[PDB]
Amino acid sequence: MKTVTVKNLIIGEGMPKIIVSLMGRDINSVKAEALAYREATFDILEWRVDHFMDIASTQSVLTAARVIRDAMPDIPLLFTFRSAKEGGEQTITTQHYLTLNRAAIDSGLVDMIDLELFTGDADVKATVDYAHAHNVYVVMSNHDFHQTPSAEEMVLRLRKMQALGADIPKIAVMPQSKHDVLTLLTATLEMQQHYADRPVITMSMAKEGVISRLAGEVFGSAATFGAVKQASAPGQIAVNDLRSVLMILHNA
Ligand SMILES: O=C(O)[C@@]1(O)C[C@@H](O)[C@H](O)[C@@H]2O[C@@H]21
């Protein structure tokens, strides 16, 4: 799709959309964070479910989703379990990971889910098709918190997500140099101009990669993450400062 419309939001045109991550270890924490987040300005709420420390209970997770909706009933909601090996707080079985995403989809509470590409092709393609049958969008994702792959590897990774039916391919990579930031910006622009028929989200993390979080309108990332009080990955800046920069670039 040229653009992904979610609620009142067009992803893939105009200024990149601003995502913040909500991180709560229990239901009381999730409630407090949701009430604090609704006094910040952003386009999409990501719920980082891997920070929730009663992950074994599917209904506990759904109860926490309902509290987020009690506080922010309408905001586009992205449900993300991030595995430890890709930057997250814990590891679950493949079966439970698919059960949590199926429950999220079935709840009617969530607009998008995050699926990690390296979960495995048959499992990812099934959850994509399930999401789509329930009018839920899929951000398919991959993360490297240690290094930056070649531009060719990043393009082919994003293309494989597209091939598996991802609405919005996403990749986050860690620069070890400033040249690595250019590699990520080059891959991004190759997707937007040539290899993608849908929006992509991309970022080079850490301080060196901050420009990648600001320059989406230029090089073709459709969304960008900011911090309300606490970053969910290195390089996220204050969401008001992020908004300031996006508006200056949009307006020249
Ligand atoms: O902004 C980043 O660098 C992230 O690692 C944060 C994640 O919470 C989020 O799901 C996006 O994977 C990106």
Author numbering: 1 to 252
Article sentences:
Several studies have identified the enzyme type I dehydroquinase (DHQ1, 3-dehydroquinate dehydratase, EC 4.2.1.10) as a promising target for anti-virulence drug development. DHQ1 catalyzes the reversible dehydratation of 3-dehydroquinic acid (1) to 3-dehydroshikimic acid (2), which is the third step in the shikimic acid pathway. It follows a covalent catalysis mechanism with the formation of transient Schiff base species´ between the ketone moiety of the substrate and the ɛ-amino group of a catalytic lysine residue (K160/K170 in Sa-DHQ1 and St-DHQ1, respectively), which are finally hydrolyzed to regenerate the enzyme. An essential histidine residue (H133/H143 in Sa-DHQ1 and St-DHQ1, respectively), is also involved in the formation/hydrolysis of the Schiff base intermediates.
In addition, the reactivity of C3 in the quinate scaffold was also explored by introduction of an oxirane moiety with an S,S configuration at the C2-C3 bond (compound 8) to compare the geometry requirements of the C3 position towards nucleophilic attack. Despite having a reactive electrophilic warhead, compound 8 proved to be a reversible competitive inhibitor of the enzyme and was very stable in the enzyme active site, as evidenced by resolution of the crystal structure of the Salmonella typhi DHQ1 enzyme in complex with 8 at 1.55 Å. The crystal structure of St-DHQ1 in complex with epoxide 8 crystallized with one molecule in the asymmetric unit and was solved at a resolution of 1.55 Å. The calculated maps revealed clear high electron density for the ligand molecule 8, which binds to the active site via a salt bridge between its C1 carboxylate group and the guanidinium group of the conserved R213, along with a network of attractive hydrogen-bonding interactions with several side-chain residues. The enzyme structure shows that the introduction of a three-membered ring at the C2 and C3 positions of the cyclohexane ring in the ligand causes a twist in the overall chair conformation and, as a result, the strength of the contacts of the C5 hydroxyl group, as well as the accessibility to the C3 carbon by the ɛ-amino group of K170, are altered. Thus, the hydrogen bond between the C5 hydroxyl group in 8 and the carboxylate group of E46 is 0.3 Å longer than in the St-DHQ1/6 adduct, while the interaction with residue R48 is shortened by 0.2 Å. More importantly, the CH group in the C3 position in 8 is twisted towards the bottom of the active site, thus hindering the reaction with the ɛ-amino group of K170, and the side chain of H143 is positioned close enough to the oxirane moiety in 8 (3.0 Å) for potential activation (Lewis acid). In addition, residue K170 shows a bent arrangement, and its ɛ-amino group is located pointing towards the carboxylate group of D114 (3.1 Å) and the structural water molecule (3.1 Å). The unsuitable orientation of the oxirane functional group within the cyclic compound might justify the lack of covalent modification observed experimentally.
